[PDB]
Design a protein around this ligand. Structure first.
Ligand SMILES: COc1ccc(CN2C[C@H](O)[C@@](Cc3ccc(F)cc3)(c3ccc(S(C)(=O)=O)cc3)C2=O)cc1
Lengths: 99, 99
């Protein structure tokens, strides 16, 4: 699809057998999901943004279905206010900006 | 232009007679610029994101030239780590997401 930006670019995703809504975020290097039940091992990590840093859990090779496109990659889980699909997954679904 | 997301979508902007680089950020409702010398009055404001909240100064009707497209709107100035062009200005230059 083509998506204009008058509203937040939210899409439905399926991850870990669960359905969530997430923001397509060209300003996010990484994908960061609200606290949720993901299976497997992980590695602690810190990420920064506006207002400071948060500790997250880093899961690799996680399958996400993003508005019907499948992608595999790193997903961070932690105290984010909104589910964020970052560039590590946006490139996998062929997402571009256009103006 | 069409912009892929393998790298940060940075563009050159001109604001207040100054040249800066800024991130085209579909995940940002607002435009937030690193501390910089803007003229005029303002109103204090708080914004939130990953890692918490920051206080910014809100300037309205600011002219920004974003990769050669002119836009006028609200610009926030404060302790952001990166210059962010948010959706309030992205809609004005006709920016879309495509996948
Ligand atoms: C490294 O991997 C990451 C890092 C951060 C995030 C969370 N992100 C993505 C938002 O693009 C961003 C922009 C931003 C990103 C990095 C950074 F160092 C500084 C800023 C943002 C900007 C403005 C607004 S606002 C107040 O206008 O709504 C909201 C969000 C943010 O904080 C995810 C992954």
């Amino acid at each position: 699809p083509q998506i204009t930006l008058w509203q937040r670019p939210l899409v439905t995703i399926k991850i870990g057998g669960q359905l969530k809504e997430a923001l397509l975020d060209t300003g996010a290097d990484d994908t960061v999901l609200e606290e949720m039940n993901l299976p497997g091992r992980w590695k602690p990590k810190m990420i920064g943004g506006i207002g400071g840093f948060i500790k997250v859990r880093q899961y690799d090779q996680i399958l996400i279905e993003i508005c019907g496109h499948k992608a595999i990659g790193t997903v961070l889980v932690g105290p984010t206010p909104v589910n964020i699909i970052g560039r590590n997954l946006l490139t996998q679904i062929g997402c571009t900006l256009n103006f």
